[PDB]
């Protein structure tokens, strides 16, 4: 079932990249009560927190991540969002290798490197989640 197996990889690699790159761009990560500028229900993301109701609904600002190197490093990692960005970059490289596998069947390392990239992208996604929650 190699033809179906490669179909699952091609469909999944694009689906994984599309899902993760949408999450980074979108600002609906957390539903918390904050202030966009009276405390009101707001929806936030990795870069901007935006109000869900109220007079200023629809208009919102950029998250101020910065207001004991433990909190400096964690906030610098969370502010730059490098781990969620790294997962998208790894997925993009992993997707490129899958596409080039058919175009270059002489080397077998093209499809193994793709499998390594997706596993590495998933690990970086776990770290980004833990940093975001912390």
């Amino acid at each position: 079932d190699r033809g179906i197996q490669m179909l699952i990889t091609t469909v999944g690699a694009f689906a994984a990249f599309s899902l993760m790159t949408i999450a980074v761009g979108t600002d609906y990560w957390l539903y918390s009560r904050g202030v966009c500028r009276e405390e009101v229900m707001t929806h936030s993301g990795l870069w901007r927190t935006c109000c869900l109701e109220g007079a200023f609904r629809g208009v919102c600002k950029k998250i101020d991540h910065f207001p004991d190197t433990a909190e400096y490093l964690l906030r610098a990692v969370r502010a730059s969002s490098v781990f969620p960005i790294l997962s998208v970059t790894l997925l993009f490289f992993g997707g490129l290798c899958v596409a080039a596998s058919e175009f270059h069947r002489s080397r077998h390392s093209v499809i193994l490197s793709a499998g390594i990239f997706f596993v590495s992208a998933g690990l970086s996604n776990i770290i980004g989640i833990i940093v975001y929650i912390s």
Partner: protein
């Protein structure tokens, strides 16, 4: 009381990340064991990781240096998480005013009419 109160000691976020870590550990343990010189299939790795996390062991164990690093850290993560669950539950099983009611406004308060 609660039907699924046995998950109370650890927060919902911790339980979600334990599942994600278990999936990641099994995939990595399957990957390093397969393309190495010296029966860790994808399914066997999931069985081993589930047994290792739950302190029940398995009939097959890693034999490579790279495979044993994955098993070693997964065992250590298991011991800290299982001990954390037992310790926090013991604290739970061991162990509020009119001003509180005056300060808030979510609970409506009224009076008698013509009084």
């Amino acid at each position: 009381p609660g039907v699924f109160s046995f998950l109370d000691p650890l927060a919902y976020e911790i339980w979600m990340c334990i599942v994600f870590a278990y999936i990641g550990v099994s995939v990595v343990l399957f990957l390093v064991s397969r393309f190495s010189p010296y029966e860790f299939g994808i399914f066997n790795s999931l069985w081993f990781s589930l047994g290792a996390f739950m302190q029940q062991g398995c009939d097959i164990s890693p034999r490579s240096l790279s495979g044993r690093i994955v098993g070693g850290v997964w065992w250590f993560f298991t011991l800290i998480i299982i001990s954390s669950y037992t310790a926090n539950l013991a604290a739970f099983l061991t162990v509020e005013s009119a001003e509180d009611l005056a300060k808030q406004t979510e609970i409506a308060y009224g009076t008698l009419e013509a009084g």
